């Protein structure tokens, strides 16, 4: 599970 | 052109203060020999962490440097080198032995390389402190060395550590004491001759960090 904010960036 | 007369009588005292001490009231000198003026940290990013601006007589400022996070920076590094000399159970809590070594060590660096001892000690710490250090990663049970950069306080802390350990280990079973081998370190670390302890051991820490980045 990715930490939030990182998963913004690759999305 | 212009003169200021500030002293009006020949200042003589009933208690005789010696000829080398009355001369020492113009500039403050380390161990009454070594001037803090004309001593430049020849590497930027290390000024504000190597503190040679405020001159000192002996390397024994007993002030509190442990309380704040970065209070450790303003220790005048000659003392900060003596503090890392008393690192062994045979040596903890004996500072006057360590100060007597440095005053004997700083003489040796003069006799060999005329320049200054204290310009060499500053130039030693600029060379041996690494520029990229490698850390361990988690990686899910299979750890690889991940290379990062290093804060300039750690660059000074580990630099001072490698010199005194490098002197304490090279003078383990030799007729050469701690005082002379440390002067063999700092002169070689000033040139970066790769024949000292710390210039070698930096050149793995910057070698390993290049391999995996």
């Amino acid at each position: 599970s990715l930490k939030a904010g990182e998963r913004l960036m690759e999305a | 052109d212009f003169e200021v007369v500030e002293e009006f009588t020949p200042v003589v005292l009933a208690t005789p203060i010696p000829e080398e001490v009355q001369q020492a009231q113009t500039e403050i000198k380390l161990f009454n020999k070594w001037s803090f003026e004309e001593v430049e940290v020849k590497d930027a990013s290390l000024v504000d962490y190597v503190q040679v601006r405020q001159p000192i007589f002996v390397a024994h400022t007993a002030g509190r440097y442990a309380n704040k996070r970065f209070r450790k920076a303003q220790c005048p590094i000659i003392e900060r080198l003596t503090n890392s000399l008393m690192m062994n159970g045979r040596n903890n809590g004996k500072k006057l032995k360590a100060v007597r070594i440095i005053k004997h060590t700083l003489d040796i660096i003069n006799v060999l390389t005329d320049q200054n001892p204290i310009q060499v000690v500053v130039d030693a710490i600029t060379n041996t402190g690494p520029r990229e250090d490698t850390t361990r990663v988690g990686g899910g049970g299979a750890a690889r060395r991940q290379a990062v950069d290093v804060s300039p306080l750690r660059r000074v802390n580990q630099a001072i550590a490698l010199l005194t350990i490098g002197a304490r280990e090279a003078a383990f079973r030799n007729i050469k004491t701690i005082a002379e081998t440390l002067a063999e370190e700092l002169i070689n670390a000033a040139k970066g001759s790769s024949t000292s302890y710390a210039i070698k051991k930096k050149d793995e820490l910057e070698r390993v960090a290049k391999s995996n980045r």
């Binding site: - | 200042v11 005292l13 009933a14 208690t15 005789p16 203060i17 001490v21 009355q22 020492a24 009231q25 009454n32 007589f57 002996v58 024994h60 400022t61 007993a62 002030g63 006057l96 100060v99 007597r100």
Partner: protein, 125 residues
């Protein structure tokens, strides 16, 4: 009578009773000149109140200092404390006030431990 001023100086468990009176310029520690202090490396730790302000200001005064308690080092921090306090409390009494604030700003910029006792009272976290 005789103009004197008595100041104290205190490190770990060592007192320092420095009588300062107008005189000729002798500076004694325990009935012995100040050029004969024991640890011999820290002798310049007690020349600090002599050499910071300038050795001219001791030309008219006497500094009788007697110390008990402490060790070898923690007496040297007591005689450098009571000479600095004994000098800067004679210029506010029997010499000029503007001398005192020149001294109290001189010892301050060098080392504040000369004047006020750095008391290392404990802390619980």
């Amino acid at each position: 009578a005789v103009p004197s001023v008595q100041t104290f100086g205190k490190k770990k468990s060592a007192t320092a009773v420095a009588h300062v009176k107008a005189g000729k310029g002798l500076i004694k520690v325990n009935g012995s000149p100040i050029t004969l202090v024991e640890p011999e490396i820290l002798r310049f730790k007690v020349y600090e109140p002599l050499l910071l302000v300038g050795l001219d200001k001791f030309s008219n005064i006497d500094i009788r200092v007697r110390v008990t308690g402490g060790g070898h080092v923690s007496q040297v921090y007591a005689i450098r404390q009571a000479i600095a306090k004994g000098l800067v409390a004679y210029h506010q009494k029997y010499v000029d006030e503007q001398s005192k604030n020149e001294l109290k700003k001189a010892f301050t910029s060098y080392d504040r431990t000369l004047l006020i006792a750095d008391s290392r009272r404990p802390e619980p976290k």
